[PDB]
Paper text:
Bacterial L-asparaginases are amidohydrolases (EC 3.5.1.1) capable of deaminating L-asparagine and, with reduced efficiency, L-glutamine. Bacterial L-asparaginases are homotetrameric proteins of 140–150 kDa. Each subunit is built-up by nearly 330 amino acids and consists of two α/β domains connected by a ca 21 amino-acid-long random coil. To obtain high-quality crystals, we took advantage of the highly stable N24S L-asparaginase, which shares identical catalytic and structural properties with the wild-type enzyme, but has largely improved stability and forms highly ordered crystals.
The asymmetric unit (ASU) of apo-N24S, solved at 1.70 Å resolution, comprised 4 monomers, named A, B, C, and D. Chains A/B and C/D are associated into two independent intimate dimers. The biological unit was rebuilt using the crystallographic C2 symmetry operators. None of the protomers contained a complete electron density trace in the region corresponding to the extremely mobile active site flexible loop (ASFL). Protomer A missed residues 15–30, protomer B 16–31, protomer C 16–32, and protomer D, the most complete, 15–25. Analysis of the solvent content inside the apo-N24S-binding pocket confirms the presence of the four highly conserved water molecules (named W1–W4) that are known to coordinate and interact with the rigid part of the substrate-binding pocket. As previously observed for the wild-type apo-enzyme, in fact, the position of each of the four water molecules exactly coincides with one of the oxygen atoms of the two carboxylic groups of the bound L-ASP ligand. In ErAII, the C-domain loop establishes contacts only with G28, a residue belonging to the ASFL and not involved in the catalytic process. Such a tight contact between the two monomers in EcAII intimate dimers (present also in the enzyme apo-structure) makes the size of the opening, useful for substrate access and product exiting from the active site, quite narrow.
Numbering used by the authors:
A (entry chain B), C (entry chain B): 0 to 15, 32 to 326
B (entry chain A), D (entry chain A): 1 to 14, 31 to 326
Write the structure that this text describes.
Amino acid sequence: HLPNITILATGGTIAGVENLVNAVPQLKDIANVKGEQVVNIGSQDMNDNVWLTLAKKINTDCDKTDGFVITHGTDTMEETAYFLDLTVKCDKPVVMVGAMRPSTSMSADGPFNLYNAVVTAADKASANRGVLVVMNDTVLDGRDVTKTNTTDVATFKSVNYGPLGYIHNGKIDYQRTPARKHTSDTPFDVSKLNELPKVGIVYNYANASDLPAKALVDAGYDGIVSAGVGNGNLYKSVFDTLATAAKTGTAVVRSSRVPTGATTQDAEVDDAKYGFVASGTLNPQKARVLLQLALTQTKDPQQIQQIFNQY
Amino acid sequence: LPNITILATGGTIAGVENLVNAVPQLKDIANVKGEQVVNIGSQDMNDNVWLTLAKKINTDCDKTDGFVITHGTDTMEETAYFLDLTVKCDKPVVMVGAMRPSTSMSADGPFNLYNAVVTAADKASANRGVLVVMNDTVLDGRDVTKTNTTDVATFKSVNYGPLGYIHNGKIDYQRTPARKHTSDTPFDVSKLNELPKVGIVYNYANASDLPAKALVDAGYDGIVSAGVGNGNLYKSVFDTLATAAKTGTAVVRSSRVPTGATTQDAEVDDAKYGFVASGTLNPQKARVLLQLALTQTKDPQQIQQIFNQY
Amino acid sequence: HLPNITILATGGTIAGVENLVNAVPQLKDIANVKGEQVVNIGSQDMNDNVWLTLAKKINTDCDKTDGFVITHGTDTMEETAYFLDLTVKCDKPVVMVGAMRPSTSMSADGPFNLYNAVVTAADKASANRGVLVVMNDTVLDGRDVTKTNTTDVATFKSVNYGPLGYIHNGKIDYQRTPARKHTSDTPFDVSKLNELPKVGIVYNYANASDLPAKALVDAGYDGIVSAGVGNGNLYKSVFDTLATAAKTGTAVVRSSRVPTGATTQDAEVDDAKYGFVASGTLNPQKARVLLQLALTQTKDPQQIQQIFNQY
Amino acid sequence: LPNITILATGGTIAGVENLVNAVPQLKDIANVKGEQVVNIGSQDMNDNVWLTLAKKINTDCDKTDGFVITHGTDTMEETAYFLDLTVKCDKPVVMVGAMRPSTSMSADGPFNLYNAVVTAADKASANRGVLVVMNDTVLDGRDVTKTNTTDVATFKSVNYGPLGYIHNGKIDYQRTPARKHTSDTPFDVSKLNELPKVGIVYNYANASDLPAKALVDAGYDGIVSAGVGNGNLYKSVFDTLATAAKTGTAVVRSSRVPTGATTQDAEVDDAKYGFVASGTLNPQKARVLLQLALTQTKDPQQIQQIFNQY
């Protein structure tokens, strides 16, 4: 008896959706695989509608399978993974996987990546660890995982807290699990939502224009995430715009363009004075995910900060 | 002992005249003179300070043996690259800051400043471009970047590595940047009062096109895209920047991904759209080169050549 | 009411033992500190006797304090930390700390390192995580922590599974804990031992002499750890000597000189055929610690392998 | 197309004559000829193979445009440095291997070999020393090391970084090693049948002196210490090596620590004891340089100078 694993595809094939058991025939040795094409897009075009589709599908079909593998482009896999980490209520394994080389190229990584993703989704030890990303023989938690390099097959790393386990010869030695609350331990419930609160991201740098921030404010955005410099700092003109926005109903989260480390609460910005929230180790795109979901529950900055301290 | 000028741009990391008293060991390695150029937090760094610093270094080159610039860490990597392209003095120019306040336990500023002066005093530091010295390491201004929000070891040359390490006041240099810098560039800011307007837009799932449209509507000369993966763009952002490029806006594809190049000949046909690929330059560094490129040319093929040489 | 923290010193001072509350006066704000000089040596001379002294002291004095900080040289801190991780039965916090710069040098790291070590030992959340190392604002588990650079203040990293938490403004956000069994979950009990089994380490490289391995065998060593090349591979002459030793009573553990990754069981060496044990992610010096302790319980290679799979 | 010679030292990574059939895309970039020099696992690499490879490359230099050497990954970093010091051909010499078996899913060997040939065919690769090409990256033979036991991305130049990255068959080189290599070294193995005996001892808590004593008793010409921290030694190991140095044994302090230099002027008075500090050379790389140094001199001051130049 092998586990039933459902592959949900979101784009092109990473090996070579119903043909994957022929493209990677050794999947037969580890699982009974069934494939469904959910959508077909490049992940640079990933969007809220696809996120809601995936969460609802996994939650609806949880009782019909033993685990899920989602094939997904690498560019925004880290965003989808965290969205699902917060909204999936199935605690069976949910594993995302992609490929940094075309499936037609020399030494394509897709085939073995898919094999190892199925290994992970079939391992009972993978349950209750949240939504996972499996790339380059490594199991990574959906919160901390990020794409660190533009081209390397080894690009995906959990840059602050490290991987959960390594895969060798079809076996995983798990030595870690994420302590932040995920899946069925979060209050986020998207089962009935057709849309998510509007949250945009602005970058900070020398001489930064306030026009991007102002355009999101003019459009009535529900939240703005700042990709700050250093420990979440803001260029003066951007600071001025976001200070006004926070006092007129917009939720403002300070994150950082710096690729590792937390944007902390007790540094150079008096968040309580301005009504801002500090993102911790969540990078701008991950902080956007959590802020959108926070905004389904509350608009209060103190309550949003508590959310950013727990999930 | 060599004469070293410390140009301060903010608060102390260890008045500016007092640094020899804060770090008395500096007297054993250099004759130090300090000047306060501006006094701002580096999160508020801007074009006017960049122009002031380049002009000052170029004007005072003959008056000193080397320069150390004290600077906040948040945007040091941007100022370093700007100076790397516009300074024509080939005497050492070294930037330094501190990740812990000078008043805090185990403050890093004192030894960082000591090592920055060591570097500026070392004859072997000349002709290597503008340098950043942090955590016992000499880093080239092009590749150096702040990798962590809090760690004293945050500054790293994440693609090509450091130039040398400092131990007991001595540097073993094993590398130098091949990209053209300082007097090997055509960028000459000596007579400029302002720089071309270049903004940065971020890409992510469901990204709004409104930031890009706002820069276009303001007549920006260039826009850098902090793309996903190998410089890819969310569809609506792509569409806005493609239309803008047809009108003459310079568009550089960079990446929010912290290491690796945004390459030509990947998923985006840059020649078709009139875009430029930034290579290993991250968004804020690509902005620096794009502003300077736009002092010379608006033509995308020529801008691409600049992004392949500097 | 502040916690009672005991500082156990093993060498020179890292800040500036009873004077430390004067060298770092802000310790008064976070703990009631008492210091004891256990030994006074450079950690390059660390040895079994000091290890046994420390474990027995912590176990004896557990009920007299709220947590422990051990000041220790950096060169072998990673070895002592893992030894204590396996032998301490006090589940109150035990934190090791050192300094990469002299306490008299510019920007000495010792003072703040000690402050943060006391913060960690005083945090109730630090309990039950095993023996810890606190360096450069980071809390690291004793198993995976290793010295990665010869001079950098940021040298200590948990290179396979990452840190447990980061320290900012005297507060720790713990997001991980080690899954391998430690402290009171191990069977290793050194309370009555005056000596440990003899275990030496041999290096592998091109053209490697068998003479180091032969000298340990001739001396009747109880175990030998190989610092293998790649995934625990051995130069032919070293392989030949260790194959003979394993069949004549010596325990042989394959580790690797490679600084990250596991020496795995199902690679190029048939460990069952030769009676060898694979060390997993334990580097040679850490594998020595566990092998010495395994040898207090058993000489059987299969049982030693199980130990290397659980601790 | 350039003529590239593939010298194989073990099993295939993608007979040796068949590589153009395993990787047909090689025909689009080079005229490839293969020769099997030896057939061993690289964990069994040894002095005789090193001498064979250096002599073969030096003899056949005029007959080809570049060399690729296929080699096991376990000791590739040692062979690369040996060749980096002894090859006098300044045409490209590139080493390559594979972390996954050629028969396994997503085997890395095929593309690694393709990129190695790209590198050997690129005129810009010349005069950079012996190179290792792995995971789309060109790495200098001195600093390159295997950092992980299993990862395809294991090879990194952990102190000074890579020389260039390979994308779509093109290399952007931004660095070159400053330490002297190839024809800038005095090491000449053309007439040597053997190399001086150099062994490596490890340091750790409670370390036995018996390994060191065994090498001394065998009359080893040199011993490298894999020290703790900045090249420190356990007392009993120290005492044995100090006595041996007084008798003429060459002793190099390296470090088991995987990055950073073993420096002069730290905790060990090298001049007093007659020891040599290895710098950034790890134990196995320090052995390579020490063996070659001992073909020229037994004097510790001269050996230290060699460790400061190569």
